[PDB]
Structures are given as structure tokens and as C-alpha cells.
Design a protein around this ligand. Structure first.
Ligand code: GCP
Ligand code: GCP
Ligand code: CA
Ligand code: MG
Ligand code: MG
Lengths: 337, 341
């Protein structure tokens, strides 16, 4: 995946939490928000690098998906588990995707209905960090199929339920073939995050822009400024989905497209850059937990050190406390790519 | 232009209005609504077939434009068409490029040059023997996040502005939605349903068919399988920004639209495109005319009976008017019995 960089950081952070006896902190949830069809599920699964989320035309995501990535230590290499099926273990990622669709139909029906009941999915991997990603239905305007008159408000409040959590990062997704000032994602992000401390803007579908136009002004922050960044991506077309085009090919073609059409900005756009940018934000959040961790170490070390003049297990736990203080310093000094 | 069919009917109406001394039947105003950039100004000017509206990327329409088409008689004729703005008093505009520029100029004066929006309309009349008497209203597009000079409540200011025009019961709403967006996200159809819940005066226009993602098309949308729209769902293809930059003509735009529909939507091609949008509007306008003939007829009788009384049951004026009103009555029946090709 393009988000493996934090693995060694979280591994040593775990070591500290194990030593100090505390429960490890939770990274913020990464939540995708935007108008229906803006490319949300495509963006979110690109952080995983495995195809597991239903994507397509019209209304697709019809329940929240709480996708918990769970790091697997030494204790198929990758596998999935849904809460609703209890213990069934999925090694086939196409089957995982199909089960999301199955579960969605079971609760939301087979005629465009939307339910707030979340689907809980765990993906176990040695190549993922402990991180929760949240896929959501897109905002809409006119009820279709089974949807009630107030479907727009039902969806919007569903989204707010997730992004009003102060420990969430918002991926505000807007299609490039729409005017940025019409971004429903950015409007709603600014309601819960008025100062842009936890909103990252993603501009999808660069490849679908009208001839004679481009997203240069948008991507240079000259339309709507967004503090944490505005990152352009090119995910698979419906034709590509139908033809089962791989992630590898999608990424290669995305890179080529940016080099061809956005050469001056290409190194600050694309899916790999999105992943790196999210890593930096997650690291920022990690560094804010460290003072809390620090004070804990200092109290327990003074507690073990008063126990002096049994004698080995307190002596080497004092050694393990010392190691934890240095690990904290290392985390603070760690550079990511 | 594609909306000349009603000319003979409105000439007949004018003969009656001239006799009756008032323009008793007013056609509904045609008002374009939709999200910013949905292609509204492009659709509206296509009903004129002359390139007078500013069109482009980003925010373009920033004041209402009340565009009054005024049919001109042969006696008032004379290279055959011109424009006048209320704000430039009696200045006559002969060049339609200059008319487009003046809309931009007058927008900049009141709305500024950093994306601001004003509700104050620009009033423009276009005089021509090739147009009917018809008011078209261009409006700013709906938005979400303030930019430039725009205030924090820009979205509501624009939505409320649109509502003021489309809440007029004597208006046909062109609800414009870009084809490269999901129909269920149509701000145009949402707002239209607030003033026209029953769909009696809302026509859905689906623009930018040419921009749809590979592996997708608007067949379901155009067949009414997504959101049904009683009066119709009509797909169009107007000029791209590259086309605007390359000065592509209206003639070529329409030919390419026709070709596109033939290639991509062959089964539906004859019920889509710009000419079909015009023909659909013509039918709606003719239905309003037919609805109002009893009023017009009654009004003739009010005058006829009156001049007959002044005719002892001045005299010469009464006699001429009675004959003119007799003619007017005959014209009414002809209009009623006219069916469009
Ligand atoms: N050409 C192109 N198509 C894209 C891109 N990203 C997504 N798509 C296409 O857009 C459609 C929507 O993709 P998806 O990721 O399912 O969007 P979504 O916003 O999750 C849909 P919902 O709002 O219902 O959940 C699909 O047909 C997909 O192939 C892109 O960058 N370029
Ligand atoms: N490819 C393509 N481009 C179109 C079509 N219709 C309009 N455009 C393009 O979309 C952009 C917006 O067109 P315009 O007619 O100004 O839309 P508008 O909705 O009036 C813009 P505003 O909301 O600010 O008034 C222009 O760049 C124009 O070339 C279409 O059918 N196909
Ligand atoms: Ca006659
Ligand atoms: Mg989705
Ligand atoms: Mg416009």
C-alpha cells in the first residue's frame, strides 16, 4: 500500500504503551465526504491499495462502512472479518467487496435506499497500520427510488455524525469537472472544522475536465484556499472498472497524466502524495499524544526507583522505562516518505 | 434561430392587440436555473441562435439578465437586428459581440471584478424580425463556498434570487443539470420542485452529454428512468471552452450536437438536441396562447359592443373599429385552429 510509512513508528509507539501499561491512543478516523459520485470510495480504497469497496455509477455507497485496518504482528497474508458474519475469514478481496454489496442490500434494500447502520469490517495485514477509514454515502438533492422526501438531510446528518468527531481527519472530495466553489465537501467540512485544522481537499477526475480547461488555479490554492493541501488524483473510469484495470496500472497512468498535464505541480499531486500527506497529519497527531505519554513514564520510573535497597524485575523495568523515553524522542525526530 | 415557428401566430396576435389597444396575452418568461457552470447561459442563448451571453469557466453570470426579445414589423425594420440596454438609454447596438461585452461591463460596474454577485437585473431588448415577443432570464448559478468578494451567505442570496424569478407562475423553468453529474444531485430540479411541485412548468435540460465518463451514458436519465420529469428531459451538447476559444460557430455546434446524438443515442436522437428543446418550448408557449384566447375573445366583445352603442344602437371611428374587431374575432379562430408542424 501507499501508506506503510507509519508501521515502524506505531510499532515503537506500541512498545511504549506496552511498557507503561497504558492503552495505546487511537489515530483519528479518516472520513471521506462529498457529493454523490465525486469518487469517494475510489479515493478511500486507494489508501489501502487493494480493491475492496463497491464503486460504480449512480448511487453506490448506501451504508457507512467502518473499515478498520488492523496491523498483524509476528504472532494468506491479508484477510478480512465482518462483525455481522462473526468468525468467517475472507482472503478473497472480490468476495469482501461483494459482501459489502450484499450487506448493503440486506439493510438498505435493492432500490436506492440509504441506511445509517454501519457495516463493520476489519482488514488484517502486516502491511497496514492500525487505522480506521470511514466510507460514506454521498450528498444528494432529489429523492430517487425508495428514498424518503428528506433523504438529503438524512445523509447530511449521517455525515455530520462522523465528521463532528474532533478526532477525525476529513477527506473533502470534489470532482474536478465541477467548479470548486460548488464543493459540498468543503462546505460541510468548514461547518465542523472552521479553521481547516483537519480537512484535506482531494480533487478527483482531473482526466474528465472540459477541453480548454484545467485545475491549475484550484490545485495552486487560487480558488478556495485549504490550509492542509489540495491534492489532485486520477482514479479508474467506469470503463476501467468494467475492464478490471489494476491498481498498479491506475497509478502508473495517474503519474503519466500529471506529468503530461500538470508538470510543474506533479510532485505535489497524485495518490502517493495524498498518502504521504495523510501520514504527515497522522504523525502530527501522534506528536500531540507524546507529552501525555512522557509524564506517565516519569511517574512510574520514580515509582520503581524508590523501590531500592524482586530486585531484578524492578531494575529491568526501570531499563524499559528509560528505553521508552528515548523511543518518544525518536518518534519526535522521525522523518517520513 | 430554432424558435421562429411562432412568428406567424404572434403576428396575428399583434393585429388583435393593435385593435384591442393592449398586449392581452403575455408569453411565460423562460428562466434558466442550475448549479454554477451547468451550461445555463449557453442553453439560453441557443434559443436565440446569436452569441450574446457571456459564457466561460468559473463564475460567469453575476447579475440577472432580463433578455426581452422584441419582434419587429417590416415597417419598423432595418444588418436586421439590434439591441438596447435600459442603462445605456437610446444607444443602439448592432454588433452582438459588443452586446456581450456590455453585459460583462455592466456586471463589473455593479458586481465588481472579484467574483461578487448582485441581484440588480440588467435589462436588454433584442429587436429582430426573426424572434417572437419573449422574455428570457439568465441567472447566476447555485454555489456552496464563498470566493472573491462574496459574503458568507452567498449561497442563500443566489438561491433566494433564483426563487424570486421562478416563483412567477407565468414562467417556464429550464432546470439545467450537467450530464457529468448524477441526476439525483440536480440543484435545478430540487429548486424547481419547491415552486412547481406538480411539474407543470419545469423542463429538464441535460447539458454536456459529451463530457460523460467512458463506460457511462445518459440513456437512463434521458428515458426518465432516474427522475421522471413530466414535460420532458432533453439532452443538449453546447460548445466546450476550447470551442469558445477557437471561435467555433453556432452552425457547427448544432451540426456536431446532431452527429453526437446520432452516434451515441440513436434510439433517442429525434427527441433530444437544441432544436427539440425549442420545439418543446414552442408547444408550451402555444398551449398558453390557446388557454388565453377566451379572454382575448371576451375583450374584443367588450370593445365591439361598446363601439356598437356609440353607433347609435365619432360615428366613422366607431364604424372602422367594429370592422377591425370583426377581423380580430376571425383571427382568434384561426390561431386556435393552428397546429404546429
Ligand atoms: N474518469 C474518472 N472516473 C472516476 C474517477 N474517480 C472515480 N471515477 C468514477 O466515478 C464513479 C464513482 O466512483 P466512486 O468511487 O464509486 O464514487 P463515490 O463518490 O463513492 C459514489 P457514492 O457517492 O454513491 O458512494 C465510478 O463510475 C468511477 O469509475 C477519476 O478520477 N476519473
Ligand atoms: N463540453 C461542453 N462544455 C460546455 C457545454 N455547455 C457549456 N459548456 C462549457 O461550460 C462552461 C460554462 O458554460 P456557461 O454556458 O457559461 O454555463 P453557466 O451555467 O451559465 C456559468 P454561471 O453559472 O456562472 O452563469 C463553459 O466553459 C462552456 O464552454 C456542453 O454541452 N459541452
Ligand atoms: Ca387575415
Ligand atoms: Mg462510495
Ligand atoms: Mg451563466
Amino acid at each position: 500500500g501507499p501508506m506503510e510509512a507509519l508501521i515502524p513508528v506505531i510499532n515503537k509507539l506500541q512498545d511504549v504503551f506496552n511498557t507503561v501499561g497504558a492503552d495505546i491512543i487511537q489515530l483519528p478516523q479518516i472520513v471521506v465526504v462529498g457529493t454523490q459520485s465525486s469518487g469517494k470510495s475510489s479515493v478511500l480504497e486507494s489508501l489501502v491499495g487493494r480493491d475492496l469497496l463497491p464503486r460504480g455509477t449512480g448511487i453506490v455507497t448506501r451504508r457507512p462502512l467502518i473499515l478498520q485496518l488492523v496491523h498483524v504482528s509476528q504472532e494468506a497474508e491479508e484477510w478480512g472479518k465482518f462483525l455481522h458474519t462473526k468468525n468467517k475469514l475472507y482472503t478473497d478481496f472480490d468476495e469482501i467487496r461483494q459482501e459489502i454489496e450484499n450487506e448493503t442490500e440486506r439493510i438498505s434494500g435493492n432500490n436506492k435506499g440509504v441506511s445509517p447502520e454501519p457495516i463493520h469490517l476489519k482488514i488484517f495485514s502486516p502491511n497496514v497500520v492500525n487505522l480506521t477509514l470511514v466510507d460514506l454515502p454521498g450528498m444528494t438533492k432529489v429523492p430517487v427510488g425508495d428514498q424518503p422526501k428528506d433523504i438529503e438531510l438524512q445523509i447530511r446528518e449521517l455525515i455530520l455524525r462522523f465528521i463532528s468527531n474532533p478526532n477525525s481527519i476529513i477527506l473533502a472530495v470534489t470532482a474536478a469537472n465541477t467548479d470548486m466553489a460548488t464543493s459540498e465537501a468543503l462546505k460541510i467540512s468548514r461547518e465542523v472544522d472552521p479553521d481547516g485544522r483537519r480537512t484535506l481537499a482531494v480533487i478527483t477526475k482531473l482526466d474528465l475536465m472540459d477541453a480548454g480547461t484545467d485545475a491549475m488555479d484550484v490545485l495552486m490554492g487560487r480558488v478556495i484556499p485549504v490550509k492542509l493541501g489540495i491534492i489532485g488524483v486520477v482514479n479508474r473510469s467506469q470503463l476501467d472498472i468494467n475492464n478490471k484495470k489494476s491498481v498498479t496500472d491506475s497509478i502508473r497512468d495517474e503519474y503519466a497524466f500529471l506529468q503530461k498535464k500538470y508538470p510543474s505541480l506533479a510532485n505535489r499531486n497524485g495518490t502517493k502524495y495524498l498518502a504521504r500527506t495523510l501520514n504527515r497529519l497522522l504523525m502530527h497527531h501522534i506528536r500531540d499524544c507524546l507529552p501525555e505519554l512522557k509524564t506517565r513514564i516519569n511517574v512510574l520510573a520514580a515509582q520503581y526507583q524508590s523501590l531500592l535497597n524482586r530486585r531484578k524485575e524492578a531494575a529491568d523495568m526501570l531499563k524499559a522505562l528509560q528505553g521508552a523515553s528515548q523511543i518518544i524522542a525518536e518518534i519526535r525526530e522521525t522523518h517520513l516518505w
